[model samples]
Target chain A: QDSLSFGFPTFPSDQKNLIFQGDAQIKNNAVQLTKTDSNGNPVASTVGRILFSAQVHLWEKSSSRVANFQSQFSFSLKSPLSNGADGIAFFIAPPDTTIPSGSGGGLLGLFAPGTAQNTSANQVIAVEFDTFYAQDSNTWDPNYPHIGIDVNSIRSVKTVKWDRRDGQSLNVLVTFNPSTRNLDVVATYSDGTRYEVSYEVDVRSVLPEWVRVGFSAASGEQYQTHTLESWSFTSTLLYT
Target chain B: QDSLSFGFPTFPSDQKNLIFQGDAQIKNNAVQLTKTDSNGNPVASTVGRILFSAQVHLWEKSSSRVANFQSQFSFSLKSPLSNGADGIAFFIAPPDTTIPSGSGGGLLGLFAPGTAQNTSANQVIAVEFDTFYAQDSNTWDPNYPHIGIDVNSIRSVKTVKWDRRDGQSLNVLVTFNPSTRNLDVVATYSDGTRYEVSYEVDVRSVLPEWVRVGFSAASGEQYQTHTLESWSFTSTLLYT
Candidate 1:
């Protein structure tokens, strides 16, 4: 009763069972997690998210089991010049996760503005494909598009530079292994350049047993259009 | 009444309006145009296709105005090793298009086996992302994975080498400009490498007013897996 396996080869016009919040919109069959106008112009200073409607079953207290999950998705981000800002992430958080009220730009819609450490109730695990660089003590973002693993905080514990390739197709695969407590991420950009990073995160301590999984993105002063073309996810619980 | 615009961000579980034939299967939300066993082994000497349910309107006898269309899709091809056979194509043919009898392997499901040139009734336009090299008076395929523009024949009128990076995400944009009589194709592999080719195909002379647009692929003695993650298409008619 707690299994989850689904594939979306193409999103339906009606969006069936997905949830959208903030400036997110569905256009021409892609999930636009950031705002864009009718003419395809990016609406600066916006944040948005598209999440699966159902919460994933991560653990069972009675059986002492944790879930091993794999998720794969395809996306693209393009800007007029090379001045793209912020970026996007695949995240898992509390079942009722929504865009933080004041979180846009480098925050990636996960943490609120002017916040660093999170209380236990606000924990989040994310693999961010970040573009803009932030030198502040809070973000310390890499200078270009980089893949970072975040656990309850935006400052990534592990990071790998994702070579800048504007307008190229990107495919990302994320897997969590309960036995190893490893959350691994592999990103392949169109043309075969690949970047991979991994970090150990005990989900039992970072998130509730039931959590929401989806994508979040934002645009600050400079921006690009972020879009998701396809996604597939599968999860299995491992018994102790 | 003849305009067409649609996007598949993620294909639905039901596949709503898609038509599948031969070895094609919708698995984990992707259009797998070639046969693969449940254990993910390639089924040799197979052919398959996944097509849009509706026929695109290409021209009108009364208006004499042809159509300009653009289609973009993302896909990945991977084999056990470097020896992947055949490839895949985005094809256009008569409204009643179907897989040719005894067609498999390198013919790409568009032409009958042992046929040199197609009869008028069998006309087809295709952009093949080919992995195999067929050398003869007939096929004259390039030595490596290449982007080919085939007009009614497998021997492409124009070809450009598409660097083979097995399992990398590939994004392709195909645009047919009525004014220029050019069917232009641009393919980008994950990592920013791009290959482009163009050929003039007058739909008026090559096809009827209505046509079927979709994907077709095959596996010969050697083989691989082909999957389509997402696709979006838009078509417009112009008046003289």
Candidate 2:
């Protein structure tokens, strides 16, 4: 058995194995995944993203075994509005994945709206901490703050309302179990309140043997800052 | 300044300093604050309440000082439905407070609906973990699961949506600061996820100098079990 593992207690000074796009920056040892104004307040209508530089081995051909992965991260979302703009997401996508055009606000910087929302071409799996409620758009969201499991689309397959406490750092645990083809997400708040959601999905059917994993976020007319404080991930595949 | 404090890590067999009403009972070293079927499933249309037997000195008239109190308790709510009926509350009311006759479901066992909802005669301050959303009735609640600060009225003075993880025991901390006349509530899940809500009100305007502090819960057409695993309270008043 072999496992792929990496830990980022804090980002390095050289930006080593990380790639940033748009507004993302390493500030105070954390990834500030959105634009902030002079006063450290989030700027409106912005997109930010960061990805691990190397491709990860997600499946084995001869053994026909799919990888089982677990990841934990600490992050915070802060905004002045009662409901913040857009959201933050942890995602696994194709190795060459790039920030899509027209991806902002409710789009979550994952894929452009209207054209390839649920298409297989937009192969991605994301866990979203969404703050906005987009009623008129095709990407209609819940009225309250929520956590969603998105597969190849902005529309969530599984969703649960979350307590959005402004300026509080929260912990999130995501695990993919190949035996049951289940992707489970557990988000723990500062006070030990835990909310869990799960979706049954086999990533092998949608993605290639190698993939990229990282974070993405966006802010709309109303702004918010999404920051990643700490992250650790391990993916294991066993040969029979 | 000295403080009054007590801790109940687990309920004693004697049930000292505690009083139960309606379907409330002590079971498995916890206070089961509602009725359950023989199979241990929650029964419908029931009210359960428990109160500290003796009144606590809330305000010292000579010094013109109001007590500052903080309480922490562990509890859980379980139900088979997507949304359970009624809710649970940590409350402070008049010394001779008793379960109101019409206090089922949304009434929360504090006062009868319609008649004394917003009156000074109600004289109760509570932190409610509400599940079901009532729209048509006077107690119109939020559309999602929420934590609310209720002063006299069943309609909350302040409220925030909460992530309701079924069957998970949660820890809640409630504190009242006389200097700011603020009551703050923090509910933590098993995983460290915390949701907080607060209200600003002075008890001297409504309640007497002495009060009973305890727990209350109710179930409507849908059923659920509310259990209190542990409780601790401390109240302090200073002399000039």
Scored against the true structure, residue A121 in model 1 reaches a CA lDDT of 39
Lowest lDDT 10-residue stretch of candidate 2 chain A: A8-17
lDDT for A145 in candidate 1 is: 68
Report fnat for all candidates as fractions from 0 to 1: 0.00, 0.00
Q: Which candidate number has the best lDDT?
A: 2
Specify the CAPRI tier of model 1: incorrect
List model 1 lDDT by residue over A1-240, tens digit each: 234555665554544447788998888777888999889977789999987755676776656889989999998888886768788999998877777877888888999865634544368898998888857623567665689998877878889987767778799899999999999998897678888899887889878777878999999888999888888887777874
Best by TM-score: 1
Cα lDDT computed for each candidate against the true fold: 0.80, 0.81
For residues A1-240, what per-residue lDDT tens digits would candidate 2 score against the true structure? 134455666653434457888889988778989999888888899999998754566776655878888889999888878877788999999878888898988898998876446666589999999888868753467777799999888878889998878889889999998888999999998778999999999788878877889999998787789999988877776443
Model 1 chain A, poorest ten-residue lDDT window? Answer: A8-17
